[PDB]
């Protein structure tokens, strides 16, 4: 069960990150009109 | 170009008549305070529970400790009125700078002073503004600390012998107990913040709020954002309201909770039990009466095999049975007494039951946060006669519509704010429609 | 000019209130209608039929009151004025339930009124009639709950009463009796109806979200002219949209108004048939095998047999004072009950 | 965009509807209010007055139990109360 | 029917004496009872122990008799079980008990008498729905 | 010039004039006591 | 050509079939854990003791369910508000008996739903779209909430919420209107408003569009190949329409301006359910539907009935069966 549970917080982690950074990641200028 | 029916959005440029706008609303907020603060007293009958008599203003003032003494017993109400004397009287200030900023003052701020102009998009003054804002907040959490450690104290539910205002002279420090508590479950048994039971971690944590806050509100003075701050964030007025109505959609949801699950900043003597507190007095009455008749309640075994009075949580505690077995986190002042290291102790359950625990048991089974909202006490099948419907269901229902709306408002003015940001709030431009230079999915 | 074309000339003029040959039948019946629920629901009774206040002056609210179904020993009388019970007294017709068949049946001349007067008016403008077609399914609704299901029972006691609690009692009783919600033809109604509120939900919030910038103003209503030939919202973006998030989306506007049309006014058709069904007591109300095994495995539970027991409890704690006529007298040991309530 | 009968804007701002109205609205409120305080209201419809639904030792219904009888049941019923 | 004189009047003490209340004091009673006893005590019955209730009959049967305006009056001054062998003030309120029962404070003797009315007349209205719970709602 | 009565001045006070009455008949009402 | 800025680029494409985007970047995992497990526990899953008083309940159809019975139960009383993942039991079956399926798919399916309404605005922006479809999502989405989390918080156990079954659905909806009076609560009934009046206004709006169709086809074809996705020109005479309904009500109950139009269709049925969903939020603090039981009596103090009378008779034959070996003392508390 620790196994599971070591690995569920790995992959939310993981997916949690990507979220986090990829909304960092210049997502204003990620439109079709102005990007700034 | 706004229709009247969004009228003060045309306000986001004319900085002098949005602070009059402000400060009006301001006047607004502290003369409801003042106003039914006053009104609350004037209804007020000592000799009748707070929370028999709708009040949600004097049991806040009451929790500071003026008014009250042991066992919530109110001494003298004056401090009630001054408080609502002093509201109400302060908002003809605020409402008459209100409406002179609104109607007679300069329309727009940034030609009268540098200091107190601002464009949304200058993102160093917009940054000073918010320190300052912190710095204040800083010192109204430290206000609190002042009255609970020099002023008086605050009153204590837990206080030995049945409530009472107490000073707090041992504030708690140790971050590994104050922010502790931020990293807690929300779920049951943890509670997140809302678990905070004893007015030493509520003063150590307004007095690491207040230094948090003044930090930071000298920080933002001091500083302009980061580059990658710079990129993640629209700057414009109604991206910050947008921003800051997420914050009170979020701050509204856990006041919901507080006032629903706490009993320490919400004492039950003011505000009426929790619900989980009601449903276990309910089975401590029962167990009461029962065992005054002769029942062995260790051993009465149940029609579902189950405890009739006790059973066991799915950790072991001795907990009451019955469908409150949902709520056997709950922790009150007039139920610990009976806990021991394994949960409730049938030596003590058989042996130690006070007369005044049978009364605040009764009392709270009979004051269950179930009503009309004609204010008909009890479950919906009651007949009319108790007119009742706890503080606490007020509050929380009220505050949940709020906090929901104000999400509402957050994603329709977050979501405006970016399209406005890019240029297309107005609509897609017929000769630039970036779907017809898209290709086609299929 | 002949007196008949004279008279049409006059009932088709345009005027404030376009009035047609249709008017003669709806205006007199849904006034009638109208005027008998605010008269009864404001003045009369339902003492001697029901045992029941049901009226403003009775200290009822606007929740409570209601213009209460005939008694049950009335069985499906007309109830007419003139007729053998009232025999002309206005005073007990009233007392009677005579203003629930009044409002009942001028209502379904009324309804059906209203529909020729779609149709005539679809017919004097140009258009087609498909607003009159999709009215079917609210008069569907209305003679198969109003009507038929009290022909098929015992008298009009048990029609709905025209008022907000009764009509909620109404549907108490139908869960309790019926079996109501396990009925799939109510199933298929409930789909047609929330699904209508969906479709005109996400068509409405598409439409304004894929707006053409038509004007230079914040507020994007003023852009439109009832005369312009334009498209005011992009069809184009709109599919692409709805295309990568849902999977699919609609591309023909045609079928699209069609499809929102076809929806809820099947799904009242549905519901519709169920209740014809319930006129005979021909419900839905159990699964023959769920029974079997219950009836021989005491530990079998499903969220069905659940459902039966709290029906059970419904029917015996309602039924006395819910059917006065009846004479129920149900001691306290025979209520249904679980343990502590 | 009109159909030739007189605004209703223009009519409800005129003096000469509210010199008729403001006789007429009243009237008929107080008419209204006549029809009950003077209890005319119970006697047309037949409604109980608070004292009119039991007898004074009873707590039975006065319910309309036959079809072509029912007229004289109501009857019958009232003149328990006399 | 309405509230007569006959309906009004209830037995003063268990020798026969009667009282005949006015409309007046039945109110004030309601009221009262409502303020300090529905709580628990909502329709006749005792919502914290309801094998014990607040019919006529029940309280024929309590030592000290209760059913008559003397034996409830000092049954608000002075409760005991229902055998009488034991004064139960510290936790039913009572004028005994006021101190921790608050709202026994403000009640004055002919607040009691209206409340014993009130408790004695109601049976005479409501029949078995008094005291008899939720079955007769 | 404007006709005063028309159908629709039927139509409106067909309505207005009987909620009226019954405005003020409910009102009364509110006073009764039993 | 950076291998971030790539994924970047991939994961906010325009161009795939299905939007990905950040959102669903935690919609897409939660929603499939969720699924996945929905689908497997409604087949398979043994009986769960919703109610924790070891009374299993058979949700699956491998245990006697069809599909209008089968449902995944709530998880067991015995646990109330407290989190039970897997790692949490001693043992799969364990996890099983007491309801931990239910859990698991709640809490994804809300991320996930949350997210997909994210995702709503999120593609709205890379289209160069208006934003706020996502807002009367928050209708339905508020009402999945409301039944799934907020109930159950406030009444302490998330064997109250709402089971994942049909049958399940009619017994949460019974129980609540014994508990609440839900049929009285003016929330509800606004709902009823949003509801209906929404299907009502589906209804006209396509039958008015549908009725001014301009002709452009024969009798032997659908009229919808009339349209061609695309095409600039409207398809309808909306002035035809409006001619039709204002002769219908009258002139000024009728709409001439097609964004009034939508917009109203817009927001009243995303308005009712706004409101039908505060009010299952606001009756999880037991805030209940108006009580008008014995309110009115008569000059000698007998109730005289009504309507609401009767309606309690009903939700008292609900109260006093269900969950019928649950309650061991007087009041229903929760
Ligand atoms: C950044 C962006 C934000 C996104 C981040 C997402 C992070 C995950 C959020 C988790 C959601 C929580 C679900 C469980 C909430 C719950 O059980 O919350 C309850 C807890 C309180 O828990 C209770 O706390 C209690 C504390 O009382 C204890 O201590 C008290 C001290 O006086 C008393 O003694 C009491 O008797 C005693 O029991 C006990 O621990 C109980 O067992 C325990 O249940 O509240 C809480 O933690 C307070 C906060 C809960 C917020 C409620 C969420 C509502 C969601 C709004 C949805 C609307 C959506 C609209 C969409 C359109
Ligand atoms: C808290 C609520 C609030 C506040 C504080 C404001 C404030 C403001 N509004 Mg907004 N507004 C609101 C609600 C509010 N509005 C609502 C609910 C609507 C929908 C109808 C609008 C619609 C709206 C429109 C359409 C417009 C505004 C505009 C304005 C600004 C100029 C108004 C002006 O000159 O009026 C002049 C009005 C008067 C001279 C009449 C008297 C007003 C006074 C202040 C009443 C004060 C009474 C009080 C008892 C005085 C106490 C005095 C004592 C303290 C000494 C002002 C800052 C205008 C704007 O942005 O200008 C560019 C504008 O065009 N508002
Ligand atoms: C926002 C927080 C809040 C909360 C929790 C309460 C709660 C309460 N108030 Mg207070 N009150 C408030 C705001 C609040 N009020 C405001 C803003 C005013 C000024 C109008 C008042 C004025 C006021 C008076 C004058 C009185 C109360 C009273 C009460 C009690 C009974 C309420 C009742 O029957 O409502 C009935 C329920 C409704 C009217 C339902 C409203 C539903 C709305 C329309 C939906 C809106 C949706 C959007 C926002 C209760 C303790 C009464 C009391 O007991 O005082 C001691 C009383 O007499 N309040
Ligand atoms: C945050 C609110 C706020 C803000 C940002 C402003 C900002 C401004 N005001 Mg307005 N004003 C406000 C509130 C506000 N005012 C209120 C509440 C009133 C009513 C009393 C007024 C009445 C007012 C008038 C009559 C005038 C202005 C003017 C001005 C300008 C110059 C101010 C100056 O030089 O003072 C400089 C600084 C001081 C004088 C020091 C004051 C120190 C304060 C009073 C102490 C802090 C108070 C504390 C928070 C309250 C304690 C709580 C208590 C209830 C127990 C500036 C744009 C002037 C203007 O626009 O001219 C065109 C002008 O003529 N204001
Ligand atoms: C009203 C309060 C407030 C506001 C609106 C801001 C706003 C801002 N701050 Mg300041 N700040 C404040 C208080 C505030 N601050 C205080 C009190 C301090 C002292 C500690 C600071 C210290 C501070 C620093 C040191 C920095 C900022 C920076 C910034 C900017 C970027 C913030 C950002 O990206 O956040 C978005 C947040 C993140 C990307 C990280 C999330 C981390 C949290 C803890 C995760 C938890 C999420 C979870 C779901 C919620 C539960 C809480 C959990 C802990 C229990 C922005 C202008 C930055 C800047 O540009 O400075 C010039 C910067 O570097 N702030
Ligand atoms: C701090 C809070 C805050 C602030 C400052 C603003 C500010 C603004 N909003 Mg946002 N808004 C908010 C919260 C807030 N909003 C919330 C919580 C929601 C979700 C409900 C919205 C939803 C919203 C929409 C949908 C729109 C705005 C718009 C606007 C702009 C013009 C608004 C206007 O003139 O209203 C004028 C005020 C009225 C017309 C009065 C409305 C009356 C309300 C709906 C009824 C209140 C009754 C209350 C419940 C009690 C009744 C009880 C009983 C009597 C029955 C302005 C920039 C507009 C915009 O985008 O402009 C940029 C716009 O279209 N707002
Ligand atoms: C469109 C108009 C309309 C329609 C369709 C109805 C329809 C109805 N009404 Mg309503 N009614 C109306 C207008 C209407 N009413 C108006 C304007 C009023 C106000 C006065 C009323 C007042 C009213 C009351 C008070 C009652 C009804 C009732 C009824 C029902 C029975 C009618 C019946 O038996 O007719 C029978 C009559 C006909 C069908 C007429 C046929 C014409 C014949 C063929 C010609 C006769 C030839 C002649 C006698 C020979 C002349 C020779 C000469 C030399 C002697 C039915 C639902 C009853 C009801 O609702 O029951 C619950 C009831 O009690 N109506
Ligand atoms: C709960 C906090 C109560 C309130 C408030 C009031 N009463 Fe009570 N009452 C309560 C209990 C638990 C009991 C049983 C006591 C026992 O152990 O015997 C009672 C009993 C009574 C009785 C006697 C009933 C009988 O003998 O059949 C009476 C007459 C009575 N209580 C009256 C009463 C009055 C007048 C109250 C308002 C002043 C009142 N009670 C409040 C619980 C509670
Ligand atoms: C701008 C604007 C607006 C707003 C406004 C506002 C919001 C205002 C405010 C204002 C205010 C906010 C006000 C206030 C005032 C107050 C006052 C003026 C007070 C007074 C007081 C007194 C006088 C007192 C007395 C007393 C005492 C002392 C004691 C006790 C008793 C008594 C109570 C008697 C509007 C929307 C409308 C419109 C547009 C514009
Ligand atoms: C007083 C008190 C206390 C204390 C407290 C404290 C100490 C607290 C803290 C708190 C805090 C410390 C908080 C925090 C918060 C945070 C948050 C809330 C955040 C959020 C974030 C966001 C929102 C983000 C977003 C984003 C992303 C993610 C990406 C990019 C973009 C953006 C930026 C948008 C206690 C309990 C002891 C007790 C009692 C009293
Ligand atoms: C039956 C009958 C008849 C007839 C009758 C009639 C026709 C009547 C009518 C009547 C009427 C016609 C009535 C009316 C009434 C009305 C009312 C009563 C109203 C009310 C209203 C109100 C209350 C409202 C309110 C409101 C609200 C709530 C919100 C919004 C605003 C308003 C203000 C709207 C005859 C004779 C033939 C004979 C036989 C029998
Ligand atoms: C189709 C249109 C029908 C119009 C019906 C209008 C009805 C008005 C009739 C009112 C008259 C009632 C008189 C009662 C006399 C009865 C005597 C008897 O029953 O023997
Ligand atoms: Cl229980």
Known sequence: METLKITVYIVVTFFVLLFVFGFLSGDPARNPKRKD | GFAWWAGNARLINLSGKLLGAHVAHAGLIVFWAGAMTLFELAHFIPEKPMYEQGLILIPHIATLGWGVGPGGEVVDTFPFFVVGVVHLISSAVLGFGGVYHAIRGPETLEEYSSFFGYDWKDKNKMTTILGFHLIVLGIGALLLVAKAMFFGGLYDTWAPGGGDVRVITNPTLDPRV???????????????????????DVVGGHIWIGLICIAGGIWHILTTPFGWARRAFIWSGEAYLSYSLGALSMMGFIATCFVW??????PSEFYGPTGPEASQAQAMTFLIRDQKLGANVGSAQGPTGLGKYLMRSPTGEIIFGGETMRFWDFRGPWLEPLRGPNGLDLNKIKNDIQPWQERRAAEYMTHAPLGSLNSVGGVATEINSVNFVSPRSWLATSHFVLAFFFLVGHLWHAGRARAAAAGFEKGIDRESEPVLSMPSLD | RGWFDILDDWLKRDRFVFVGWSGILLFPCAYLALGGWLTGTTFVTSWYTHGLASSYLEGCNFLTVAVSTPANSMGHSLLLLWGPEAQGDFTRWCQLGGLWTFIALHGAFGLIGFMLRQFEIARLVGVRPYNAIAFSAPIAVFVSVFLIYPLGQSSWFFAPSFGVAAIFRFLLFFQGFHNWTLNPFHMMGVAGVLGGALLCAIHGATVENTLFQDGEGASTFRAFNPTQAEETYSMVTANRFWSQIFGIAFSNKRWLHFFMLFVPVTGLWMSAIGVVGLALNLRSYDFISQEIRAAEDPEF?????????????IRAWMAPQDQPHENFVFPEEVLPRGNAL | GTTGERPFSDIITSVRYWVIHSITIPALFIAGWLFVSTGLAYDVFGTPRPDSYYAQEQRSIPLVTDRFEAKQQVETFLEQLK | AELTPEVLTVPLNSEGKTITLTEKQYLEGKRLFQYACASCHVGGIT????????????????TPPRDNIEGLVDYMKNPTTYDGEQEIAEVHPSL?????????????????????GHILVEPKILGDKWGGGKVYY | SYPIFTVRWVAVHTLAVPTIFFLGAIAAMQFIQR | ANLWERFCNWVTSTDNRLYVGWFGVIMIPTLLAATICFVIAFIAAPPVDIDGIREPVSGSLLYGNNIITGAVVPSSNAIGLHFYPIWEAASLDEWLYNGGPYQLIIFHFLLGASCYMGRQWELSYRLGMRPWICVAYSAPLASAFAVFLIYPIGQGSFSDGMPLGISGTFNFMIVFQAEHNILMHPFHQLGVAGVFGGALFCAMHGSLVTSSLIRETTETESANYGYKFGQEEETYNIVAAHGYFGRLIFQYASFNNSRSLHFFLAAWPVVGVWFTALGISTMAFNLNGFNFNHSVIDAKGNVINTWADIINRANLGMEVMHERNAHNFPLDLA
């Open chain 5, 47 to 62: 919502k914290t122990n309801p094998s014990l209730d607040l019919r006529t009959e029940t309280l024929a049967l309590a």
């Open chain 3, 301 to 313: 539970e499903t969220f069905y047999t659940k459902n039966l027991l709290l029906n059970e409890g």
């Open chain 2, 261 to 266: 699950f706490n009993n320490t900043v919400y």
């Open chain 5, 96 to 116: 005994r008990s006021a101190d921790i029962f608050p709202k026994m404070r403000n009640l004055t003797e002919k607040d009691l008498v209206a409340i014993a």
């Open chain 2, 178 to 200: 104050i922010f502790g508590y931020l990293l807690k479950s929300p779920f049951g048994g943890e509670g997140w913040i809302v678990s905070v039971n004893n007015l030493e």
